[PDB]
């Protein structure tokens, strides 16, 4: 139960004809997949662990002005030229200053001078690309066996490494068989269109074009001595003091302005490897060769006693921690539910097969009770431990929460959000295709619109759709406007 | 929740307090209007070399 | 700032967001509105940095 009470888990139930279900695995939150006869198992993506980063260019945030040399030619003559202009280590500017007899020139008028300053730039930003050839992914899979001290245990699991080379893997769960992960890291995230920029000890994921469009001097990354910079005047200001002379002043450390310019970028790790977090990918879970823990186990014949107060998780799933007081150790727990003196059995059981492994280690079970008051029975006779739970809520409220969760997923993920619980359906595929077309056309229009400008554009667009007589586009404009209100109210996660 | 310190499941408060040191700083100086002083040159066209 | 000085409109100087203190040449002062130079980020929902 590595993922119980994680605040973002979302259940996937039902397989396809070939007993496979695909799923998108986001870093924040996991996927607990249950089937009719397969063990319910928690799957959470952990890290992407990129390696062999190549550095494209190095923006540099603070410079140093040295060797300020100048040359002024008399007016009514060619513009001043210095040998340091041709040098690639120097930054120069041409200006016009007033020259008379007191300045040495024979005839009055504006004269041209240049001030070439040798640009040496102290602290720099390295922008590193990751190639899909060496992108990695670590997936931890946990069939939540009824097991002591397993609820919400991040340290317990069976890791499966899925790289674009040999993406399809097979994770050998210790007792329940071998889960298969036939996945595609190619469509997980746009790492071709991203730059990892490492400033001091931190770093971030930023869009490639945004990184290339930054107002900062840049040099091609080749690990060479005394690099030649480009666009140096972005950290050098030349000030003409009343058109008599000019001086060269370096701006300073662009670290704070760079941290403010990074708002909206997702932070990353640098110490101990790249280990990009905040990613996502799509796995197709092949549960063909999974098996339950001894479906043929003899049913337990002695009563169970509680050992921890039953607590309801955020999603309404009960957690019962029981200790078995019998002598026949390997046995399958008898579990049943009631509702209002009627064995409706509307309460489901997430933990597929509650078997007591040792009879000395207390066993914990996660169950999903009905929305009404329900009595849960964990025994066979009158010694049966009876838990009654009242689950506050409504089925309509549950549907609304699920719809909101799905919309939030369709906001974080685009066209690929239709494959979260897909079983390869026909309606689902058509919906994915139409959403692909519409989302491409939409994000093409709103690429770059900010958080508040999206809301403003949406309210303007819905007002326009309310006042347009042609209903064929009035409905379309209102729909688009509401979608954009939602996206503006969801963006900046 | 469970596996994290206590039985009840939900959202728990958390606070991370951190000391602050300024390092570099900048100071705005008001100009004392009494001590403000203007110096103006009066050169006369006398034809000195 | 360091060896450079500027004339700035006083209201604009008071408006610019940066932690500030009385400027009474006291070592280790207390900076009002010091939250502008610290950012607290949640690693999803697990922790605080």
């Amino acid at each position, epitope marked *: 139960m590595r993922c119980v009470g994680v605040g973002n888990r979302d259940f996937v139930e039902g397989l396809s004809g070939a007993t496979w279900v695909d799923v998108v695995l986001e870093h924040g939150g996991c996927v607990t997949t249950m089937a009719k006869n397969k063990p319910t198992l928690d799957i959470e993506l952990q890290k992407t662990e990129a390696t062999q980063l190549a550095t494209l260019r190095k923006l540099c945030i603070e410079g*140093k*002005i*040295t*060797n300020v040399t100048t040359d002024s030619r008399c007016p009514t003559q060619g513009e001043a030229i210095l040998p340091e202009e041709q040098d690639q*280590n120097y930054v120069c500017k041409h200006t016009y200053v007033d020259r008379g007899w007191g300045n040495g020139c024979g005839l009055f008028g504006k004269g041209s001078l240049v001030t070439c300053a*040798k640009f*040496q730039c*102290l*602290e*720099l930003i390295e922008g590193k690309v990751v190639q899909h050839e060496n992108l990695k992914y670590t997936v931890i899979i946990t069939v939540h066996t009824g097991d002591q001290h397993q609820v919400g245990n991040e340290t317990q699991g069976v890791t499966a490494e899925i790289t674009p080379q040999a993406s399809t893997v097979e994770a050998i769960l210790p007792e329940y068989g071998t889960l298969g992960l036939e996945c595609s890291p190619r469509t997980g995230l746009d790492f071709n269109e991203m730059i990892l920029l490492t*400033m*001091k*000890n931190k770093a971030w994921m930023v869009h490639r074009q945004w990184f290339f469009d930054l107002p900062l001097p840049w040099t091609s990354g080749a690990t060479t*001595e*005394t690099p030649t910079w480009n666009k140096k005047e972005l950290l050098v200001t030349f000030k003409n003091a009343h058109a008599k002379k000019q001086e060269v002043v*370096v701006l300073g450390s662009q670290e704070g302005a760079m941290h403010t310019a990074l708002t909206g970028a997702t932070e990353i790790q640098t110490s101990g490897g790249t280990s990009i977090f905040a990613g996502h990918l799509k796995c197709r879970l092949k549960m063909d060769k999974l098996e339950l823990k001894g479906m043929s186990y003899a049913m337990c014949s002695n009563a169970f006693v509680l050992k921890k107060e039953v607590s309801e998780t955020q999603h309404g799933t009960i957690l019962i921690k029981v200790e078995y007081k019998g002598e026949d150790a390997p046995c399958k727990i008898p579990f049943s539910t009631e509702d209002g003196q009627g064995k409706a059995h509307n309460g489901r059981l997430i933990t597929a097969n509650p078997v007591v492994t040792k009879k000395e280690e207390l066993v914990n079970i996660e169950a999903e009770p009905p929305f009404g008051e329900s009595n849960i029975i964990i025994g066979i006779g009158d010694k049966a431990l009876r838990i009654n739970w009242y689950k506050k809520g409504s089925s309509i409220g549950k549907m609304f929460e699920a719809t909101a969760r799905g919309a939030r997923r369709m906001a974080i993920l685009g066209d690929t959000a239709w494959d979260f619980g897909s079983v390869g359906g026909v309606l689902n595929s058509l919906g994915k295709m139409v959403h692909q077309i519409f989302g491409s056309a939409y994000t093409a229009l709103f690429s770059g619109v900010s958080w508040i400008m999206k809301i403003g554009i949406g309210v303007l667009l819905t007002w326009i759709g309310l006042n347009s007589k042609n209903t064929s586009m009035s409905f379309s404009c209102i729909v688009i406007g509401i979608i954009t209100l939602y996206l503006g109210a969801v963006v900046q996660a | 929740g469970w596996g994290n310190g206590c039985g009840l499941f939900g959202k728990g408060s958390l606070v991370t307090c951190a000391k602050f040191q300024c*390092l*570099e700083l900048i100071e705005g100086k008001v100009v004392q209007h009494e001590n403000l002083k203007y110096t103006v040159i009066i050169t006369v066209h006398t034809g000195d070399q | 700032m*360091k*060896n450079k000085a500027w004339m700035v409109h006083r209201q604009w100087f008071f408006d610019l967001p940066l932690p500030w203190t009385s400027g009474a040449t006291t070592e280790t002062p207390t900076w009002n509105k010091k939250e502008l130079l610290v950012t607290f980020k949640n690693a999803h929902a697990k922790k605080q940095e």
Partner: antibody
Amino acid sequence: QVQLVQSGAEVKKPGAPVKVSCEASGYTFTDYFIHWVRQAPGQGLEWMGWINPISGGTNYHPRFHGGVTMTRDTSMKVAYMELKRLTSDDTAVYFCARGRDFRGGYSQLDYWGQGTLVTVSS
Amino acid sequence: SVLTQPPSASGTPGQRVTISCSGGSSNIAINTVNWYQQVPGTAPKLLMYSNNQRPSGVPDRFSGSKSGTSASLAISGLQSEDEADYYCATWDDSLKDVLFGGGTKLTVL
């Protein structure tokens, strides 16, 4: 205990690169500079550049920019330094010193190295 | 601007030693001064780890201060061990580099 120990005394002829090294141990290397000071025989002390091993940025003295290069190599906690084309004039002893990151600690140096003396003669 | 200091000396009885560095308006006037002791043949030692602040030992025989564009190291009486080469170092901002003094051979006489 924190200390800096050099590579050891070296001698080379004019027009030959030399790579003076400086070992660092006992503290967090990435949190302090290496100020690589120079001192000619019986002459005034002369600072010539520091590097930030947390990032690798180098602040050479204007005189020594281009003539010298400094590398952090934070894996082994060893702040290397190289001289591109060693001349007869540049005979001295090259200390490596530890300085603080902030402005008040730019010019304060504690735990200097012994200094690798480099003699240049034909 | 380059900060300067002259070589000085004093007798073994510690009357007073006045060893002064006069820098520009960008190096000394806005940055803390740092004093260094160098016994010949040895690596320099950080005599002052800040303006008018001592890291360890030798109290009241080494005590400095800066007023405006100049800095100095005062005394309440010298000893025989106080014979070394002294350096004042400040981080210039216009030149954006660490400036070291020209040197001074203080000899116990």
